[PDB]
């Protein structure tokens with residue numbers, strides 16, 4: 004039993020795909036443990052969430068995009084939730100993400116890619132603490 | 138432009154219909170402006186939410202049901218959001234709710250009925266202050 | 271709590287709408303308690319099922335249609351199942367069936383209308399004994 | 404058997420609901436007999452299409468909206484296609500359109516309302532000749 | 537043209553996924569040849585169906601689960617139906633079943649995995665005879 | 671930014687899968703640039719579209735099938751649209767096309783396979799000129 008951190012990104016709201024994405028995880032039988040709606044996340048939270056990317060050329064565009072509309076942060080719980088939700092998410096790159104995955108069916112850009120999911124136990128703990136410090 | 142308060146009820150979690158219900162409202166172009174997940178809503182909030190029914194025969198069972206699993210409280214915004222979302226919701230009574238409505242398609246019980254929606258401007262304002270004080 | 275008899279008609283097989291129709295009833299939380307697949311229903315069962323219409327102008331065409339492909343006969347159980355599933359079904363006449371109903375959304379003919387549902391307690395009991403003797 | 408003229412409006416493209424809308428009509432078993440994609444419809448065609456509304460207060464905004472993005476014009480064929488597709492469409496006014504209808508489920512504005520459908524035999528014939536001369 | 541045996545398992549009924557699963561096979565254009573609804577299958581039928589697993593540690597839990605609610609048995613017919621329905625089904629293991637498959641989208645446990653499908657011509661013949669001995 | 675040529679084939683009309691297929695491409699955020707409905711495409715257009723297959727044993731059956739009912743021709747535009755729509759389409763062979771793809775979920779025959787999509791920049795230019803010579 005693991006918990007992972009998922010963000011629904013501002014592009015899902017712009018495109019009205021919030022329920023679609025959440026529904027895919029719900030149908031796979033993962034349970035919401037906590038959830039927060041952000042009309043706009045503070046840039047500092049975003050910078051912390053993506054701290055590993057601070058030296059990448061896309062860092063600033065990525066932070067601007069993540070504060071460009073609402074976000075929902077969600078903690079999901081389930082056996083092997085971290086790896087499983089990552090497989091449902093699909094690859095970052097639109098040339099690679101597989102039909103059947105969230106990104107494979109729905110996303111067409113490497114940046115506006117609808118959804119974040121923690122990639123490991125270490126990072127899940129970290130990201131959960133950022134979005135749900137309580 | 139109006140704001141209305143929606144609760145996703147514990148039966149929606151139990152039957153995995155949370156996204157289905159939220160999706161119907163999202164597809165109608167209504168925007169979330171607040172949302173809170175409650176693993177278990179406090180009895181007192183529930184009793185205040187339904188204070189109008191406090192002397193009704195079904196009150197205790199209603200309150201018991203409403204604390205029997207998680208709920209999501211959401212404020213939705215849109216032109217005439219209150220009446221329009223009430224229309225989406227459908228009649229409380231499963232003998233009357235129309236196919237095409239949330240309850241008409243999905244609910245089979247007058248009590249386990251998936252969703253709450255504010256029924257007027259004044260009750261919307263009240264319910265919003267209960268869930269998002 | 272009631273039991274009702276539903277037939278999935280041959281047009282549903284032809285148009286691949288079997289799961290779509292059964293899904294609408296399943297999503298309304300009704301439970302299957304019996305079900306039989308008929309690659310081709312016997313003429314006599316069909317004629318007994320529709321015995322009330324035996325002198326109607328459409329009887330032979332109705333019976334011919336009903337043996338023109340497979341059918342599934344299902345008994346569904348739930349509180350007020352009879353009237354509620356009738357409500358899901360929609361009006362026989364495609365000029366009257368409401369969007370949101372099975373027929374309102376999917377059927378375009380008064381005859382090729384996808385689904386049978388028992389119309390009362392007494393007819394439910396009768397139809398159930400025909401298909402599941 | 405009848406032919407009716409449907410326009411998929413620019414809001415459907417903007418909100419990615421083109422297939423959703425066409426799908427509802429396809430599932431009702433209506434057949435496309437003509438279809439044209441317009442990256443931008445000519446003002447004059449739009450003004451002729453809505454010539455009945457030319458003196459209405461909303462005319463210019465309506466025409467402006469209708470040239471604000473792509474449209475698809477489609478001729479659909481089926482028994483009683485005109486009235487049946489009008490029934491699928493739903494009321495212009497989002498306070499009145501029924502859940503289960505295209506507008507009842509998807510539209511939130513009296514103007515940005517996703518779809519046009521001919522309202523009678525005579526207007527169908529007229530509209531068809533405008534879009535498919 | 538082949539026939540394969542499919543079981544809709546008790547978890548599909550518990551979770552109201554019966555139509556969802558049948559719909560996926562129906563949309564792929566496979567035809568129902570026979571179908572039986574079981575309010576509860578007799579344990580002996582289950583033990584016969586899973587006879588190859590009789591010495592596995594999960595055998596008894598598997599039999600208990602399969603008699604824990606209803607089952608629908610179905611014979612589907614179509615060109616290469618056996619291998620094709622297996623690919624739609626998805627892998628047994630939730631760490632492996634691919635998004636887009638029935639198990640990949642819907643199942644989250646190696647045991648409660650919604651659906652059985654015959655894995656070969658030899659086993660299809662066998663399983664069809666168990667569920668439809670006529 | 672690329673344009674690709676898609677045909678919705680007569681089997682999609684016969685099976686009422688037109689919107690289903692178009693919807694999958696629409697949901698991936700590709701834009702229609704041009705579109706033409708053909709009550710029946712002229713056999714010569716079909717023969718030109720499939721000119722590379724003229725010596726294959728299936729050539730005549732393929733042309734007969736393509737004129738057997740309506741077709742919609744569509745030009746779709748988007749970053750890497752050609753390769754991306756090909757991945758959504760799925761493999762020609764029903765023993766290979768993956769669940770989650772259009773063919774993987776919906777097609778059960780190597781010939782009646784619902785959808786054409788250009789396979790390269792060179793062929794897209796070519797096919798666009800055939801269906802939209804303007």
Ligand SMILES: Nc1ccn([C@H]2C[C@H](O)[C@@H](COP(=O)(O)OP(=O)(O)O)O2)c(=O)n1
Nearest residue numbers: 056061065094095113114116118119120122
């Ligand atoms: N080449 C890249 C890589 C990442 N990004 C953005 C989009 C990604 O969601 C975030 C984080 O990248 P990461 O490599 O962790 O990708 P995932 O979101 O976990 O799939 O950065 C980008 O815009 N361009």
Ligand SMILES: Nc1ccn([C@H]2C[C@H](O)[C@@H](COP(=O)(O)OP(=O)(O)O)O2)c(=O)n1
Nearest residue numbers: 190195199228229247248250252253254256
């Ligand atoms: N006869 C009744 C009436 C109401 N309830 C429960 C179910 C209802 O959602 C709540 C509130 O009742 P109300 O009449 O306000 O109905 P709505 O939720 O607005 O449709 O009480 C009940 O269990 N039995």
Ligand SMILES: Nc1ccn([C@H]2C[C@H](O)[C@@H](COP(=O)(O)OP(=O)(O)O)O2)c(=O)n1
Nearest residue numbers: 323328332361362380381383385386387389
């Ligand atoms: N005018 C009519 C009336 C009925 N039928 C056929 C189609 C109907 O499903 C059956 C049974 O008619 P009935 O009036 O009982 O209609 P329902 O199936 O209950 O809606 O007869 C017909 O073909 N033409």
Ligand SMILES: Nc1ccn([C@H]2C[C@H](O)[C@@H](COP(=O)(O)OP(=O)(O)O)O2)c(=O)n1
Nearest residue numbers: 456461465494495513514516518519520522
């Ligand atoms: N009060 C109104 C009435 C109509 N319009 C626009 C929206 C409508 O689709 C068109 C045509 O009006 P009409 O009354 O024919 O309505 P329908 O499209 O047939 O439902 O005009 C408007 O913007 N405001």
Ligand SMILES: Nc1ccn([C@H]2C[C@H](O)[C@@H](COP(=O)(O)OP(=O)(O)O)O2)c(=O)n1
Nearest residue numbers: 589594598627628646647649651652653655
């Ligand atoms: N490690 C395992 C393997 C199988 N089972 C159960 C679940 C499987 O559906 C059945 C039969 O296993 P099998 O290896 O034939 O798997 P499939 O159902 O064909 O994918 O046994 C289990 O509970 N744990």
Ligand SMILES: Nc1ccn([C@H]2C[C@H](O)[C@@H](COP(=O)(O)OP(=O)(O)O)O2)c(=O)n1
Nearest residue numbers: 723728732761762780781783785786787789
């Ligand atoms: N063995 C084959 C190969 C192709 N065809 C038909 C079906 C294919 O859609 C067309 C064109 O074949 P091609 O190899 O280009 O396949 P795609 O449509 O691009 O996947 O020919 C066939 O009937 N049998």
Ligand SMILES: [Mg+2]
Nearest residue numbers: 119120121122
């Ligand atoms: Mg990452």
Ligand SMILES: [Mg+2]
Nearest residue numbers: 253254255256
């Ligand atoms: Mg109330």
Ligand SMILES: [Mg+2]
Nearest residue numbers: 386387388389
């Ligand atoms: Mg009747």
Ligand SMILES: [Mg+2]
Nearest residue numbers: 519520521522
């Ligand atoms: Mg009008």
Ligand SMILES: [Mg+2]
Nearest residue numbers: 652653654655
């Ligand atoms: Mg096996």
Ligand SMILES: [Mg+2]
Nearest residue numbers: 786787788789
């Ligand atoms: Mg090719």
